[PDB]
DNA sequence: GCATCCGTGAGTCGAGGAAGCACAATTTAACACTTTTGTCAAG
DNA sequence: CTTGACAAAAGTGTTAAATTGTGCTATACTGGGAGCCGTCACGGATGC
């Protein structure tokens, strides 16, 4: 079983676990030798360990069996046709309930992750990680434009009244919290929901008027 | 200054029925000498319409008033049988050497 | 304050457990289909923090209002995602294992 | 000693 | 432009096919043309006959024959669809049940074997690739002197690489011979007893020597039975394993007697027979027959070692670096080795499969798993060091690349493990390996080029041709001989004068065992075919090679490869005669197969009517993008109705003029300093070159995008990109791709793609902005393809491949792929690198107008100005002679062919210059013009300098100056003459692939790395410049503490620091004080992961948290 | 004092990206129903 | 500033379908396979 994603000693130890299970379940009344019954459990344990531990991204045993069956069918069709089969033939040969899309998705799932330290070039001075940009942390441009947008919005809200600006900040999450509903803001200010909605709409209209007369905030919309 | 060949999009293409590609046609046109008989004229357009099999030269341009071709024997292209060459060449007047990337006419 | 000296010293098992935010009990890295990290795995959000800023795994807290809070449904602390670069784990070995740097580095310090 | 498989085989051969 | 040829050496044989090293070897390996019954046991057929039959031990899987089918797709289709040009390989196998006595035969499909194109290169995954031949130590028996102890020698038995362990035999101080295998040393007496040798036999054979034979006699081992001796040998080799006779004999047989595991090789066996004077039955150290071991090579090796130690006259040590002891593995041998590895893996899989599961009902198709073989083959053809990405900038580039020999690669030397011994030019490199041509730098001497006349033999030893000389007369008989055979004869030189066929010179310069000697014509045994056989293809293209220093001729030959094709490329004025041969053998041009008449001529195809009447249509490769980005196009050179003879030219290939290799332009070059613009190899060009489109090339760039399937939704390639104006989408058609022929600039969109945005709430400021503007956020975002900065051009091709297309095997999860080929016409500009065949290279530093360049008295301005100071230091005098000959040709209207080391000499160039001056000044006399006053002043200054004879008329002084190659050159600015005559001529200058347009790069902010958060590297990835250790040391030396701190923190990895600095700069403020870098945080975290407590302290030794409490529980 | 195994090091940029089968335990898409608003009329 | 009617947006509670994980195969099998190789110099222990 060597060369299937697990080292030799790992396979030996998993087979030892299977052997212990076989000893637990072995019955000598049937007059069969221990090797015959123990082989089943040893190979079962080895195969289960290969299915559960030979991939960096774990795949369930049923999906591993599906991938193995798909690979066997693809290999058989490839040797029969003398060429690489298309997804249609593989799906047809697999059986009912299989189409080209499902075969493509299964093949996509069966893609092992690629190492980040694989050298490229004659010299051992390059790696994959040197060509993969980091797209999680904001770029300096993104942080700068976010700060500019915050400053411009704060300056624009100064034109609004004291209550209207606070209502808009509460309703849009400018207080770092989740956008408070109309009833929450109304209870905070002791006002009914309809009046809160009306004052928010009036303040939004006033901000629209100011933006139309100034056009100092449109570029940040993108 | 400018050239437009019918059914040709860019200068990196080959015209069917023509031995020379568009690059070679442009190179041949760059050697064309045009004399304006009218000083006030600044830009002219010469129309060439030829059908193979022939050797289309600079003399095959349609005559234009107050315009003369000083080298009618200049070789422009070789049209194979079944090939056609319809083109318009815009010639302007200027000074110095103006690269095509600058004027972009 | 300003950093003036740097000290390096052996890390006791108690100190190592103090550093860790949780024991990594499974080798699973991520799910193959949902692409979310598996619980108690090498990439668990419950140990090393959320993938994105201010968002729990269960998707109940999604704002800075609950800053410094640990969700009861999922256990993922609601904080900046950058803590994922700074939060470590620990594996509790069944039996002790010697550090190779103190064994094969001649002269062997343990020896 | 250097090969773990060799040591394991020697152990199981006893 | 008539061609005048110089030289007196008459070559008896033409140049061999320059690509035969790659083509013939692969033809031998495949054997796809010879019928299966006539196939010999070489190549993959030998691999089949070696691994097969497979025995379970009563099931036998035997191999009968193999065949190769037609390739599924042509070369053009494979290139367009990014496929691999390969042919299906099927094997015919039979399954025999020994007990039952039944045979089951069927043809199994082993897979695909990549095919070689006619030019000698493969097409792997749609990319042209070349397999580089590997030079290594030939297998066999060598006897090297022990450096540690003088007077002693050690025998080395070397099998094929990865085909057995190297065996060492040494004479220990005690007198007992020691055999070393796999770093384990043991007494050779034991293994020699295993081979069934008695004391009497050794005493009678090796006893006629010193005390070595007496030391070889140990009664402890001799009294031991061969079986017990074998068990003891197995115990010594492998300790711990239980002593079992079957396992021990199996291990010994697999170590020194198994042909499947040990393979001395055909070359190894031949070398062993040649050296030890024995006849090996096979290619193994020992033969296992009749249940016993029989000696093959150990006894002769020991006898030779003992005789060498004693000092017999007939035995000598072996030179490890001798080129007769070093062999070449071509594409055929490497492919055969990899096929053998894959077939061994397949046989192992069959064996482990044929012993389990329905043994009675078995077929060869079920047992055979062809996946390991295909995996090994694709690994060899893709991820191997010797399988290099083809360099096809010009036909000469590919031609050299196919003829390269590399000492590196799998199983060979290494760049930093190689000493001076392998990098030096051995005496046997004469006529087999080019001495001058090699990549300078860390790979000097490790990569070389095969000589022009050299050819690799069947066994892999490079041979060179020599003319047989008998009785003092040189015959036309040519013998191709190797170095070891070459060392046994006195070989004359090709430049020896001949009175017809008889040698005229009484004293002949010859070579004896690689050393120069002076001999008589009677003692001459062989002669050189020609001076060209010593140098490779590139060096044979350098005129006046004898006047160039080797270090600079190396650079010239290397840079001849990097010359890009030009739309107005013209052949050099001074040639060597190999241009036509290079063009013909590079398969870049188009030639008529036989006599015929051209019926149709077109820019796309040529239709020819041959004599037999058949219509043959040759398509013309037009504006095809090469591997290096250059445009490879074929231009027809015939007309309709023109009759062509067999072998005549039909269409010029890339970088060719009428079948002659044209890598550059013949320009008027004046050798003089010019206002400091020539400083330090810089080159000054005239604007006249740009006016008439010289050094103007076409470069095609390929931009690839892929629309895939995503969990958020499938990416769609469409023209409707959100939040984009109509101006940006002007060039995009209805399908979202840029229209063919549209001009694109940096920042313009080539193909429009929209990707579904990740489900995530927006920031509160963005939500407030959207509410203010009343614009609902769309579900897709712009992820289209845009032209990177510094690129652009004219879009000439668009290729759209979709899933389900015939033969398009897209990667899983990818809906479609769009490739855009954009062609730009690059002209010469400041910063572009020019060079010449003599190694004089430099970047264009100034483009002067026509009226500023120095001009001849007849009004002809020079085109290029060169700094003379590059001549004396570099000692490349060949460029001066080429300049003189080019001046003569320019004023005579003719070209010259001067072969290297036998061609134009000084008197011939002087008489040509005399004729050129005669016509040049007779024209002026006929026009009615005398001698310029400025010319008179220059002549006076020259005669003050001793350049001309005083007292002569101005015409005679001008003629003398012209004979010296110098002319009176005026200044284009002042109008006054240059105070001294200036060497003005016509020189062939190439435009190299290194251009400032592709090398200029700049970056303010861009992508950052994953772990360290530092900026990426490379122009393609838009990365920053590496500020390594040495720059930091320079900054420390200057004491620029703040600049260094900024470059370490603010500009590199201080995330908060860099964000704040950018925000401050865009706000007009000063950048803030930097903070701790992220790299130090990564350092601390990794050290903690190594169970080391790294703590940062303050003045009072209190811990300081650099993580701002984010890592504190 | 000396032969010998082991470990570490050997320039800088750039341009190179091989079982299935049954069965039980866990998750979740699909609905059905209250709950909670967001907004609209009425001044 | 309020007081009622509507119309979705989100959450709660089943429902089985899909997915996932563990148990089981009873002639007899009883110690591995790949290496394998062209470098020199300098600590520095490891013994004789
Ligand atoms: Zn949560």
Coordinates of C-alpha atoms (C1' of nucleotides) in Angstrom, one line a residue, chain E residues 166 182 238 261 321 326 348 417 422, chain G residues 31-39:
Chain E
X166 CA 30.1 2.9 -8.3
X182 CA 27.8 2.3 -1.4
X238 CA 23.7 -5.4 5.1
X261 CA 19.2 -3.2 -11.9
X321 CA 38.4 14.9 -17.8
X326 CA 33.4 11.7 -21.3
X348 CA 6.2 -3.4 -10.7
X417 CA 29.8 21.7 -6.8
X422 CA 35.4 20.4 -15.4
Chain G
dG31 C1' 10.6 -8.8 7.9
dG32 C1' 11.4 -2.8 2.3
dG33 C1' 12.8 -0.5 -1.6
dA34 C1' 15.7 2.7 -3.4
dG35 C1' 19.7 4.2 -4.0
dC36 C1' 24.0 4.0 -5.9
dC37 C1' 27.7 10.2 -7.8
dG38 C1' 32.9 14.8 -10.0
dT39 C1' 34.4 19.7 -4.0

